[PDB]
Write a protein that binds this ligand. Structure first.
Ligand SMILES: O=c1[nH]cnc2c(-n3cc(CCN4CCC(c5cccc(Cl)c5)CC4)cn3)nccc12
Ligand SMILES: O=c1[nH]cnc2c(-n3cc(CCN4CCC(c5cccc(Cl)c5)CC4)cn3)nccc12
Ligand SMILES: [Mn+2]
Ligand SMILES: [Mn+2]
Ligand SMILES: [Mn+2]
Ligand SMILES: [Zn+2]
Ligand SMILES: [Zn+2]
Length: 458
């Protein structure tokens, strides 16, 4: 067995003034951190949120994990455990595996042992992970307002930007304005780990950022790849594991896997590592691949978020989903138009950035409408796309969530195609088709002008 650890990722130690605004600090570290994919943030010494819970009243059913490299795994995904009974099982496993007290096992050893065990055929080691536990039922690790009584120690951490319940609903997040209950992007998720439990190589939905906090326990080991090397990583994984790249029926059937970072390093892909300890944050940047495993019994909380910097990458992602025939979590254009309709109450920096993305959207929509008119589609009718459930407004060909416009025919009731796939609906001549649209070009230009007036306000 031979493992050459990847170089360390950047570690930041902000002052109270720097820490005060999470969004201003993330923008400042961005030129360094986006070159490594992941980064670590150590909060000021005196920032210590209170973690308190009853281990007997907290229940969950965990996922069973087979530890095999390049073996296909489902992204979404056995008995019931309390936080106490899971902890007893987790501690007994680690101490019996090494024949040592749980806290005396070196981190370098657990790391090299993890990579040996995933590559050995004759080893059939299985573990359990309390993964993707919803904060709605289980409750957040951070303080939340309840009508229970909270203590002054919990009061100071209720309104903090670093309390992961607040981060998505702040005015600097663009996901905050989305009316639809997406669930898996504005709400925090909880992770109860044990030795060797792991997360496979992946990127976030819509190429969003992520922020992870380790509340307590043994460290979490991470591997990260910068956003610029994403397609380079994917090509390496297509040659060595082609079975993972096949077309899937929906979002629930996403195929992911465990792969040694030294294999990526050999193929000239940049990889960085970190050991995240209790009380530390890890931030993942847009389109940054990441994977990892737990050193022992621990408790973590995580959430996705989108800044103004992300907006052009978000549009590029939806275009990439269309080429791959992959489902969207939400409509990017619907989010843009929702913010434009609330221009008078938006943050000035936000209004300025939304205005620039909207200008691109309008020019692309104008070109697409001219092309479908030249194909012989003459009839048209306005349609309120936001009222339809998502599974009722997807392109038959590319599976994109339609908002701005779509094509329908009376011969196929309920079916739709996006303006890129007009020839994929039916065998009828295009004069039988109808163009369904949310807004005319005349409705769109004053919406963008409202954003300009708000952005020019000083
Ligand atoms: O398309 C590209 N876009 C951007 N960069 C490209 C690139 N290079 C990137 C670098 C930076 C390497 N450097 C290594 C150390 C690291 C660091 C670690 C830990 C702490 C700190 Cl403070 C910093 C910070 C990134 C050098 N070249 N090579 C090829 C292609 C691209
Ligand atoms: O320590 C880690 N442990 C585990 N995972 C990590 C991870 N990521 C995990 C995800 C997936 C998040 N998932 C999205 C879908 C959502 C859902 C909604 C509605 C129905 C269902 Cl069934 C599921 C449930 C949460 C993305 N990253 N990134 C980093 C670290 C870790
Ligand atoms: Mn094995
Ligand atoms: Mn992730
Ligand atoms: Mn468009
Ligand atoms: Zn389409
Ligand atoms: Zn038809």
């Amino acid at each position: 067995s031979m493992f050459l650890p990847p170089p360390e990722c950047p570690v930041f130690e902000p002052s109270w003034e720097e820490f005060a605004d999470p969004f201003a600090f993330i923008h400042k570290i961005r030129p360094i951190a986006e070159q490594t994919g992941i980064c670590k943030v150590r909060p000021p010494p005196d920032w210590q949120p209170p973690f308190a819970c009853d281990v007997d009243k907290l229940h969950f059913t965990p996922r069973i994990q087979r530890l095999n490299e390049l073996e296909a795994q489902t992204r979404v995904k056995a008995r019931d455990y309390t936080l106490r009974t899971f902890g007893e099982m987790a501690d007994a496993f680690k101490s019996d595996y090494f024949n040592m007290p749980v806290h005396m096992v070196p981190t370098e050893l657990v790391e090299k042992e993890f990579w040996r065990l995933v590559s050995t055929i004759e080893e059939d080691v299985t573990v359990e992970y309390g993964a993707d536990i919803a904060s709605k039922e289980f409750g957040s690790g951070f303080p939340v307002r309840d009508g229970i009584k909270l203590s002054p120690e919990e009061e100071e951490y209720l309104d903090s930007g670093w309390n992961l319940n607040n981060m998505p609903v702040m005015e600097q997040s663009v996901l905050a304005h989305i009316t639809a209950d997406i669930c898996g992007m504005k709400l925090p998720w909880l992770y109860v780990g044990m030795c060797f439990s792991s997360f496979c190589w992946h990127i976030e939905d819509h190429w969003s950022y992520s922020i992870n906090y380790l509340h307590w326990g043994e460290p979490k080991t991470w591997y990260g790849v910068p956003g610029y090397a994403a397609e380079q990583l994917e090509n390496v994984m297509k040659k060595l594991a082609p079975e993972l790249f096949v077309s899937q029926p929906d979002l629930l059937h996403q195929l992911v896997t465990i792969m040694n970072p030294n294999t990526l390093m050999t193929h000239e892909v940049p990889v960085y590592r970190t050991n995240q300890c209790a009380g530390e944050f890890v931030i993942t940047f847009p389109r940054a691949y990441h994977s990892g495993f737990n050193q022992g019994f621990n408790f973590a909380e995580a959430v996705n978020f989108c800044t103004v910097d992300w907006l052009p990458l978000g549009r590029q992602c939806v275009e990439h989903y269309r080429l791959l025939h992959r489902y969207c979590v939400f409509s990017h254009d619907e989010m843009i138009c929702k913010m434009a309709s609330k221009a008078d109450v938006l943050d000035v920096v936000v209004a300025s950035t939304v205005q620039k993305d909207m200008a691109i959207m309008i020019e692309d929509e104008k070109a697409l409408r001219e092309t479908v008119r030249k194909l012989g589609v003459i009839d048209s009718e306005r349609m309120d796309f936001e009222l339809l459930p998502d599974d009722e407004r997807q392109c038959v060909k590319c599976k994109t969530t339609c908002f701005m416009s779509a094509i329908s025919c009376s011969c196929k009731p309920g079916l739709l195609v996006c303006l890129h796939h007009v020839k994929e609906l039916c065998s009828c001549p295009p004069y039988k088709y109808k163009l369904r649209y949310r807004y005319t070009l005349d409705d769109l230009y004053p919406m963008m002008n409202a954003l300009k007036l708000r952005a020019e306000s000083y």
